Design a protein around this ligand. Structure first.
Ligand SMILES: CCN1CCN=CC[C@]1(CC)C(=O)NCc1ccccc1
Length: 130
């Protein structure tokens, strides 16, 4: 229905706003673009599903996310990719792990404060009807 297409258009507006708030934070710069295969040719042999905040906006605009749950699976993938590629005790690996955990915690905190649970349940029920 038109009403259902309006619901998904409101979900995309919400997700673009959360994503741009994460992308402007200086802590999260390393997560804003894909890893450059030139600088890091080993990356795509270790990490089987790369993800970054520029790819997430592209996916919002392609109508890939029908629920906030499917958006948070990609935020969780950005974080888990950083934890698995950079697991060592040295300061450069510990700094990117701390930033990855902060990106995940910040996204979940904005959603807890600003997403209405009944709006998410409506999106889930339209998705399950299709
Ligand atoms: C966690 C529950 N939250 C969020 C869901 N939305 C309405 C209810 C409530 C309170 C019960 C709230 O008012 N949070 C404030 C807020 C709402 C929208 C945008 C920004 C901030």
């Amino acid at each position: 229905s038109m009403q259902e297409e309006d619901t998904f258009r409101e979900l995309r507006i919400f997700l673009r706003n959360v994503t741009h708030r994460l992308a402007i934070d200086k802590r999260f710069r390393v997560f804003t673009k894909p890893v450059d295969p030139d600088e890091v040719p080993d990356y795509r042999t270790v990490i089987k599903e790369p993800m970054d905040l520029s790819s997430v906006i592209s996916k919002i605009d392609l109508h890939k996310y029908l629920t906030v749950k499917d958006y948070l699976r990609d935020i969780d993938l950005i974080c888990s990719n950083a934890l698995e590629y950079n697991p060592d005790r040295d300061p450069g690996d510990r700094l990117i792990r701390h930033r990855a955990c902060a990106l995940r915690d910040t996204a979940y905190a904005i959603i807890k404060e600003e997403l209405d649970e009944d709006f998410e349940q409506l999106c889930e029920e339209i998705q399950e009807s299709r």
